[PDB]
Amino acid sequence: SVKKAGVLGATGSVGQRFILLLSKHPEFEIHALGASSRSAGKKYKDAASWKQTETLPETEQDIVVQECKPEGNFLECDVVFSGLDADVAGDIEKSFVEAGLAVVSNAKNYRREKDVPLVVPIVNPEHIDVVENKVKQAVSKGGKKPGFIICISNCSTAGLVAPLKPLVEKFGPIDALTTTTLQAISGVSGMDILDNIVPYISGEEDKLEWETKKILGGVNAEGTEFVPIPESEMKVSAQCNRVPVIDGHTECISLRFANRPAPSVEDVKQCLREYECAASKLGCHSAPKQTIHVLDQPDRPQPRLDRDRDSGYGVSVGRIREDSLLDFKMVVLSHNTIIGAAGAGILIAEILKAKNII
Amino acid sequence: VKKAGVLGATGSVGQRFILLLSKHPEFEIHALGASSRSAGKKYKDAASWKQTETLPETEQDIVVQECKPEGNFLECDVVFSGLDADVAGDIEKSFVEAGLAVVSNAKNYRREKDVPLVVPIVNPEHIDVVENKVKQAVSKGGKKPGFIICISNCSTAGLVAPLKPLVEKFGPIDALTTTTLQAISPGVSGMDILDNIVPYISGEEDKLEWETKKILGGVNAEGTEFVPIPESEMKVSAQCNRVPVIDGHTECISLRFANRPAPSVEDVKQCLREYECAASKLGCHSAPKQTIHVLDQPDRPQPRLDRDRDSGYGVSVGRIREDSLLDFKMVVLSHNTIIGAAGAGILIAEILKAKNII
Ligand SMILES: NC(=O)c1ccc[n+]([C@@H]2O[C@H](COP(=O)([O-])OP(=O)(O)OC[C@H]3O[C@@H](n4cnc5c(N)ncnc54)[C@H](OP(=O)(O)O)[C@@H]3O)[C@@H](O)[C@H]2O)c1
């Protein structure tokens, strides 16, 4: 069965990738596209300075970009993805929720809101239960389906937590966590980055440190709001860097378990290679069976040689070994195809589709 | 005016030694050694000049010699070594036994209990072990005994440079992380590194972890051997990466003090600003009096923006801020001219000469 999909901020970078993906999806129909006044009225192909290495089909190319209001075609969408600029996403997404619509957003605005799930779909799909219970209890009493928002974490946060989930399931809570990122370009000018390193990405470290606590966190007794891992319970230290690499974020991570003793390296590696995410078990269309590709070569993963090879995995993980300060260190290569805003967004909608929320 | 030898003169480290010595009035380039397939040839005909700056042509005409203590090598007041580790142990041993003063970049003798491992802007006082030994041999036999001082690689020197003043002021550091983003400056081809990250430098993390504890360690009661900091009292975790950058290693670092409670972030910044290395206080020519350059901009240091401008400091240090796991984190940029093998070696020779060990 085909659900109708809308895209807010459709002309932007993340918006482009949303439409590109949904275009190949057998379960979704691109029904409404939204951007600013500068774009409204134009065919998508004229509204968007297309920056993807892949071209878009003609039928999607001719679709007329609409204003970002819960109106006409947007009121007809079963799910509304959002890559809106944060300057406008606040007001707009709220009115979409108010109109009773299902919003899956990459905007940072509502990420830290207490009743809003912050979801890396290959890691914490269970955090969606909060909206699931709200929705299903509302409709069972005969009332109108409330409308809600689920937020998509960034590629960097998603890369950090991805290997952590199986490890936390098997060996219990992680109380200490470091990450130094080596982040790719995919604005950053050639002037800024060529033969250079910028040891600062604005807001990225606070994002990384705070979001991971919510994603790996829990819910309050009333089951309506999220209770992120408190600071006394888990320390997270991020250092983010831009590097002269076109595609694929690398993270050099360190971790310690709260429960003693630490497992063995082989148990850790075996845990990571064996993990199947909840979304795969639900039978979701865009979910990877295995979310992690464990690599044994001592110089792997590398962004350039493992980008395509492992594009079916959430992350590639290499150099898993015992640490000198915490328990283990390892190297993580994110894959945009799976854990990128667009890929994460579609999977959330599939999870919503299964479980009958949309 | 001291006469200088260079072993493994044709290699990357040898080239840097020769170049830097030619710009130095206190030294005379007196002997050059390399492989037997180089021996008997002018230096320009023996070497593939991989440097940016060209050599004065009078230096180019120097005939390279076999790596043996035999002719011009026997008259050198200091012999610098840039031999590969698979032959260096044999040759450097011969030189020491011939009575010569060896300053080596090779790894072979670094872990020896009696051999100083020196980052001369950090632990020049470790040379006192050699000094007292030479003092002992003069009283006993009349002649100098022959010795090795080992030079730490640029990566270790970068880590330890800002730590020295901190430890002097606030006491020992019991925990320390580093993720490095290391410049090209086996080799490393463009094919490996361009538009890519290589999360592995062979032996690098091991050296970084072990050598730190010795460099920041002490001397036994008799002043005859080195007592590196016990593993339990300083946990050091390194994660080394190669990036597409020509010159200037970046290190993303975290540290915690053993002495509780921690100083403030303001105390730390000013401690680094006020540090003047002891080699500068001795009057050594190559030692930077402003050893550390702290930068206040949120996006600095950057290798390409700061490598020429800060080429006369040991390190530039930026983004000094409170940490959430350990006490503080910060971004460190190394300056090869000062703390690289050649620059470090010349400074050691300057200290040796000032202290009459020659
Ligand atoms: N070279 C140029 O002239 C130029 C132009 C655009 C972008 N860029 C660069 O490329 C990047 C791509 O942009 P982005 O996706 O990061 O962010 P963005 O374009 O500013 O915003 C993302 C999406 O939000 C929409 N939007 C913005 N303001 C809106 C409003 N007031 N009401 C409703 N929708 C609104 C945009 O549609 P609209 O397309 O209608 O604005 C776009 O689809 C930018 O960060 C920028 O650096 C350069």
Side-chain angles (χ1 to χ4, degrees), chain A residues 1-37 39-50 52-144 146-268 270-273 275-285 287-288 290-306 308-358, chain B residues 1-22 24-27 29-36 38-49 51-135 137-221 223-288 290-352 354 356-358:
Chain A
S1 180
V2 184
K3 299 282 173 169
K4 285 170 159 61
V7 185
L8 294 168
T11 55
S13 182
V14 168
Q16 282 175 32
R17 308 193 199 118
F18 265 121
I19 301 158
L20 189 76
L21 273 177
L22 293 162
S23 210
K24 311 157 172 178
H25 213 291
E27 218 158 315
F28 296 100
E29 181 189 309
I30 301 159
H31 197 252
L33 297 185
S36 76
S37 289
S39 298
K42 297 189 184 200
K43 286 184 187 289
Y44 183 70
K45 64 167 170 170
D46 293 316
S49 48
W50 187 261
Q52 317 300 319
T53 50
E54 198 173 334
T55 38
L56 202 63
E58 206 185 319
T59 162
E60 274 77 25
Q61 235 175 298
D62 299 336
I63 194 139
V64 177
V65 182
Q66 204 172 316
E67 232 155 323
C68 294
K69 287 181 209 157
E71 224 163 64
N73 287 325
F74 273 120
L75 262 163
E76 300 189 350
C77 299
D78 295 299
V79 70
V80 176
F81 308 95
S82 168
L84 278 164
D85 171 35
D87 299 316
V88 293
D91 288 9
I92 291 161
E93 287 165 5
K94 182 185 172 69
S95 48
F96 271 70
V97 171
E98 284 172 347
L101 292 167
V103 191
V104 173
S105 172
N106 187 56
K108 69 184 195 167
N109 297 253
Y110 291 112
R111 286 187 186 173
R112 305 202 179 181
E113 174 157 327
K114 291 183 174 300
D115 57 317
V116 171
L118 177 61
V119 174
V120 173
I122 68 158
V123 162
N124 67 331
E126 59 272 17
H127 278 191
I128 291 174
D129 301 344
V130 177
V131 306
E132 189 193 351
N133 294 331
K134 193 189 182 76
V135 164
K136 290 178 172 184
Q137 291 296 316
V139 64
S140 81
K141 297 164 195 170
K144 298 158 71 179
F148 56 83
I149 182 165
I150 289 161
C151 285
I152 313 164
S153 263
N154 41 304
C155 228
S156 283
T157 306
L160 178 53
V161 298
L164 303 178
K165 186 64 176 181
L167 296 178
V168 166
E169 283 191 338
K170 206 166 189 192
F171 313 107
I174 284 163
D175 64 345
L177 177 65
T178 83
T179 187
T180 300
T181 78
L182 292 83
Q183 288 169 249
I185 298 158
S186 64
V188 196
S189 72
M191 215 166 136
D192 290 337
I193 202 56
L194 222 150
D195 183 31
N196 197 35
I197 267 142
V198 185
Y200 181 75
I201 305 175
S202 184
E204 198 77 350
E205 290 160 11
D206 291 339
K207 211 156 286 192
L208 222 44
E209 290 173 12
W210 193 97
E211 290 190 9
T212 52
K213 273 178 249 160
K214 176 166 190 180
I215 287 153
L216 294 181
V219 297
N220 66 355
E222 207 155 345
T224 68
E225 291 178 11
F226 292 95
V227 173
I229 305 301
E231 33 282 295
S232 68
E233 220 159 294
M234 178 172 72
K235 310 287 179 53
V236 289
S237 189
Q239 294 194 234
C240 303
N241 309 272
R242 187 80 64 195
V243 288
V245 167
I246 290 149
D247 281 307
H249 302 143
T250 301
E251 304 190 38
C252 293
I253 79 163
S254 212
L255 69 88
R256 182 179 68 199
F257 293 105
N259 303 329
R260 311 315 296 165
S264 65
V265 179
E266 208 56 47
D267 291 333
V268 168
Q270 168 58 26
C271 178
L272 296 174
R273 79 212 324 166
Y275 187 74
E276 182 177 9
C277 61
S280 185
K281 291 167 184 163
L282 285 176
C284 294
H285 185 271
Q290 319 303 141
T291 57
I292 308 155
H293 190 31
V294 176
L295 304 164
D296 292 314
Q297 319 92 331
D299 59 340
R300 305 293 273 264
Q302 295 172 26
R304 175 157 47 81
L305 43 64
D306 293 306
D308 306 323
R309 217 164 285 195
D310 291 352
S311 64
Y313 296 91
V315 293
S316 298
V317 175
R319 304 193 63 216
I320 302 153
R321 60 210 196 275
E322 214 169 326
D323 192 29
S324 328
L325 172 73
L326 298 186
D327 286 333
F328 299 95
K329 55 188 169 187
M330 63 195 73
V331 182
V332 183
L333 173 64
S334 68
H335 296 97
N336 184 76
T337 48
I338 302 309
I339 64 171
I346 269 76
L347 190 48
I348 291 168
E350 282 165 11
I351 300 161
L352 293 167
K353 159 84 183 174
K355 281 173 177 281
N356 307 266
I357 304 149
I358 65 161
Chain B
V1 175
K2 302 305 169 177
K3 313 196 288 304
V6 181
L7 295 163
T10 46
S12 159
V13 179
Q15 292 192 9
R16 286 183 58 246
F17 267 123
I18 293 164
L19 197 294
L20 222 144
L21 284 161
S22 71
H24 219 260
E26 277 182 325
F27 296 96
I29 307 167
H30 194 64
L32 300 183
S35 46
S36 295
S38 292
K41 299 173 175 163
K42 285 173 192 267
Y43 184 74
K44 59 182 189 172
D45 304 337
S48 167
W49 197 245
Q51 313 306 129
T52 297
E53 191 167 329
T54 46
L55 210 55
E57 200 170 328
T58 169
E59 264 83 350
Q60 293 184 197
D61 298 328
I62 297 169
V63 168
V64 299
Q65 196 185 326
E66 214 160 331
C67 294
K68 300 163 87 197
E70 271 189 355
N72 279 16
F73 273 122
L74 290 180
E75 18 193 7
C76 295
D77 305 300
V78 71
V79 185
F80 304 105
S81 178
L83 289 160
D84 35 6
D86 47 14
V87 292
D90 184 25
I91 301 158
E92 295 171 9
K93 207 55 145 190
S94 294
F95 271 69
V96 166
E97 289 181 324
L100 302 177
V102 180
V103 177
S104 179
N105 194 56
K107 68 186 193 66
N108 304 247
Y109 291 86
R110 295 182 178 182
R111 290 168 199 247
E112 302 289 337
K113 292 165 289 193
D114 58 345
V115 173
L117 186 53
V118 179
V119 172
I121 65 160
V122 167
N123 65 330
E125 63 263 22
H126 280 198
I127 289 166
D128 292 0
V129 169
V130 155
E131 182 176 7
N132 285 307
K133 191 192 84 169
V134 169
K135 206 176 286 180
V138 161
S139 192
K140 171 189 182 160
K143 315 93 180 165
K144 291 165 200 148
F147 53 86
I148 294 174
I149 287 103
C150 290
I151 308 157
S152 269
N153 297 327
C154 198
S155 191
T156 309
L159 175 55
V160 84
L163 301 183
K164 177 68 177 210
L166 291 182
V167 171
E168 284 188 323
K169 195 167 186 177
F170 310 113
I173 286 173
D174 68 15
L176 177 79
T177 73
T178 313
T179 304
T180 71
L181 294 72
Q182 289 183 226
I184 305 155
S185 188
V188 44
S189 68
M191 198 181 295
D192 298 339
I193 199 57
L194 190 45
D195 190 21
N196 191 37
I197 276 148
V198 186
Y200 179 67
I201 305 167
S202 208
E204 198 78 345
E205 290 158 16
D206 220 292
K207 289 170 197 177
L208 209 24
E209 286 168 2
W210 196 96
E211 296 181 22
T212 303
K213 267 162 259 155
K214 186 175 178 173
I215 293 159
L216 289 169
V219 196
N220 59 2
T224 180
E225 287 171 343
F226 299 97
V227 186
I229 301 173
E231 182 277 305
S232 59
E233 297 310 313
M234 192 181 279
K235 302 166 214 170
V236 297
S237 179
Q239 296 189 240
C240 301
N241 310 276
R242 194 76 80 192
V243 291
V245 171
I246 287 142
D247 190 65
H249 302 154
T250 297
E251 303 197 33
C252 296
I253 281 152
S254 289
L255 64 96
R256 182 180 68 193
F257 294 101
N259 290 347
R260 314 305 302 165
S264 70
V265 63
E266 300 87 346
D267 291 334
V268 167
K269 291 190 73 164
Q270 194 61 27
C271 176
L272 300 174
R273 279 194 281 256
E274 287 167 358
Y275 180 61
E276 186 198 336
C277 72
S280 151
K281 282 180 170 178
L282 227 181
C284 300
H285 176 42
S286 292
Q290 188 63 249
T291 318
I292 297 160
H293 189 214
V294 332
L295 296 142
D296 291 336
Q297 306 96 318
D299 62 342
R300 299 285 278 272
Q302 295 178 211
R304 176 163 47 80
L305 287 189
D306 293 294
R307 72 174 159 241
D308 304 305
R309 160 194 182 267
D310 287 5
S311 58
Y313 308 89
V315 292
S316 308
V317 185
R319 304 201 61 214
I320 305 166
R321 61 214 193 273
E322 276 167 24
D323 189 34
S324 46
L325 171 71
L326 304 184
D327 288 330
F328 301 100
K329 49 180 174 180
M330 65 197 70
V331 173
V332 186
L333 171 67
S334 65
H335 301 289
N336 211 291
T337 304
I338 304 294
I339 62 168
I346 270 96
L347 187 51
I348 290 162
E350 289 176 359
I351 299 151
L352 290 181
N356 275 4
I357 319 159
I358 302 151

